[PDB]
């Protein structure tokens, strides 16, 4: 038996006005070009407006504007994209575990697990750990000594928290994430690296998302700090003592070096790197695979790298870059020569 | 007791003609410069032809051409590299598990495991999952609800499949891979990110390889699609709703943003990034650490970045790049000035 | 009850001279600006000397030079940073497991575990594996067939060693690391990739650190080789048959392609990539996100990429780079034209 809702139930959830029959049953969501008659669609991007009248969707989330002249059933909302975002959860088939501790889970006698929490098979909860109400700990999770997960948290299978990791409410952590590991902390003695113990922890705020195989190092002395509402994609590396301001988003494969500070409402595109000990102010966007080498004090977008070219053309551009000092010297000599005549 | 074959047994496996004694016992494979008399070698690259007459190998896989004038035992084949590739499997010491389910594995009552499959210690197989004939599931694997693995599949220890992941035949997945995780799917409401449930799945074709700690996100609505014969190296990130055509290879640390479409027989070198919502046609090669920012409609090689220089020279080139608009303006003024005289 | 030492106990550990009262109790370490009166601090960087007289630290590790004129308690040492590095371990709260094998660990009958080793819950130790004295194997580790870990080794929870991985003494491996996986080894037959079995192993030296979710591939024929004292940060990818010389450090998100050889005392900054089959000599530094495309035969620093600019300025620089061949041709025509007049 598949999940099903009427257009009326869906419209109630997002405060939509149904212009058509509210009793139509809906079995899922789809984009305008993919949608069939049992699916609700949405128009967010003016670029996809071409596909609205030909869509086979049973109904479409629309602005009052885009609903005028439209022949199908409209669900009229201020913001179709946000309404889609809310409705998506009603069609999620991710399994939900019942409250309880799997018989194979190992829970230290002085760990506290809320009775409304679920702890999966072969999970390990260490001494002093605290698991809050409505938290779901997946199979094979390891929750280190004294670590805390706030109410409504969700950990996929195979998440690792080291000791002294404190997490706020409603965390979402995908499989393979490692939180509180020891980062690269070495002192050089005449060429031989000497380990510095990493004796800070991690503090994570509320409503944080952490993607698959993302690593967040513990602090060297004080904590690594992740603010509220921070969204981290997959394969991210956050080094020791990084600070991430509230509502910042980081796309996949981002790497942030030690002690960097990122402000609120920043957006780092995929594969961005930040060097250590710099600060980025609020409302900064960094485009894909940029290397950020210094502090940013002005809001706006920032970039590094070159345009992609066909390889033979790129090789010519790269050869000319190495000649730029020579070309600048030649341009200066030419200006002096023309001035003289 | 070590693996051992005669030159005759090896030659039979690849259809080689033995020019010398077929009874010579062989204990392994080696490159021409490393090989000793108990090892079979091969000449693939004309650059290594220098090392052929001095090689201590017991025998060498050779073309008819390179076997003429050669003093040792030749195994004569059309393609020495492909023959090496085939013979390597005869000397693999990777352990093979016997059919059966380890007593500590947890298998849902309505999961189906073929009796010829092996399921390792502390594996978890969820409701509705299907494990095909001759499949090997390593220790600590987690196989989500309704997920499918086709015949002859091999999962290393500690592979995670989320729910609704469908895999074709003869998959090979290395440890730490995460398939079907929730990718970065958020709607921005006045600076606050709102989660979009990721309610598509993943469809993987036949003869696919997935390397260690590689992540492949589930689709937002429809599936993320990986074609037949696709080979993915380690630490790759495949975002939601990516489509990868048949026989495409991607080297390590590649990141593909959401909804990108890659054609057949493409090759992405290490650390390549693709932005979202672009298409690459068939037979495209992208060189290492290139950022692909737009659709590619012509087959061939493509590149971005700069040449490596000594740091002091690089710093001068990077300073001149920032002056290029000024230099272009100055070159234009000079042309106008010379024209006028 | 918290860890506490007197200034005298701390000074004895690093050979410091206490200029003040040796009986002062110390509960931790802190930087000069963060430190309170129960904490020991240090002055390493001349840039932080501003903050020395105003620091609330109970005492400070100082050179004889910086101790002259200082009003507080000094612990006088040759090298405050190295003394900090040594003292950090005295304040580490990482849990230490007692010797023994957890009842849920699975240990092959012909594996050898030293009785002073600790093996955590749900660990799997395969046939022929050898675990040395004082080794700590975390929960959910998998130690493949015939693999060896030398005395004093520490594996976090959820480390995977494949078969035929040999590790020297005093290894430190963070969670999620995968050692000995099969790397991208394929032969192309008219567009179809054919697997090459990866039948080498891995050899790791003494005093090696491996960070979280780092992958180190096994060799194709001979071993992948990691020297003594090599320090690898998180999310690193080491491909098949790489050789890393002693005392080399690699920051996070570094990727080294197959068969590359790195010398002794090298330092690769974060996100560096190396192409395959190249050699880097001793004492080479490569700056962040550089693509190394050829062998380096001269010690020193090396870089690639461009300076970060505001996006609109970057777009202008990137457009001019594509015009450099045209600009060079125009500069040449102008020189010829001026010469002629
Ligand atoms: Mg990367």
Author numbering:
A (entry chain A), B (entry chain A), C (entry chain A): 3 to 343
Kindly provide excerpts from the paper associated with this entry:
LpxA and LpxD are functionally and structurally similar, sharing a homotrimer architecture and conserved active site features, especially in the acyl-chain binding pockets that reside in the dimer interface of the β-helix trimer core. Herein we report the discovery of several small molecules that bind to both P. aeruginosa LpxA and LpxD with μM affinity, identified using a targeted structure-based methodology that utilizes molecular docking, surface plasmon resonance (SPR) bioanalysis, and high-resolution X-ray crystallography.
After failed attempts to crystallize untagged LpxD following protease cleavage, we tested several variations of this LpxD construct by first replacing the thrombin protease cleavage site with a TEV protease recognition sequence, and then excising the first two residues of the LpxD sequence, which are located immediately after the N-terminal 18-AA hexahistidine tag and protease site. The resulting construct led to protein crystals similar to the published one, with each asymmetric unit of the H3 space group containing one monomer that forms a biologically relevant homotrimer through 3-fold crystallographic symmetry operation. Importantly, in the apo structure of the new LpxD construct determined at 1.55 Å resolution, the density of the His-tag linker is no longer observed in the active site. In fact, whereas these residues are ordered in the previous structure, this entire region of the His-tag and protease site is disordered in the current structure. However, our failure to crystallize untagged LpxD suggests the His-tag may still contribute to the stability of the crystal-packing interface, despite the lack of an ordered conformation. An interesting observation in our new LpxD structure is a well-defined magnesium ion in the core of the trimer. This magnesium ion, likely from the crystallization buffer, coordinates six water molecules and appears to be critical to the stability of the crystal, as removing magnesium from the crystallization buffer or chelating the magnesium with EDTA eradicates X-ray diffraction by the crystal. Our new LpxD crystal structures also shed light on a previously uncharacterized magnesium ion at the center of the trimer core. We hypothesize that a magnesium ion can potentially stabilize the trimer.
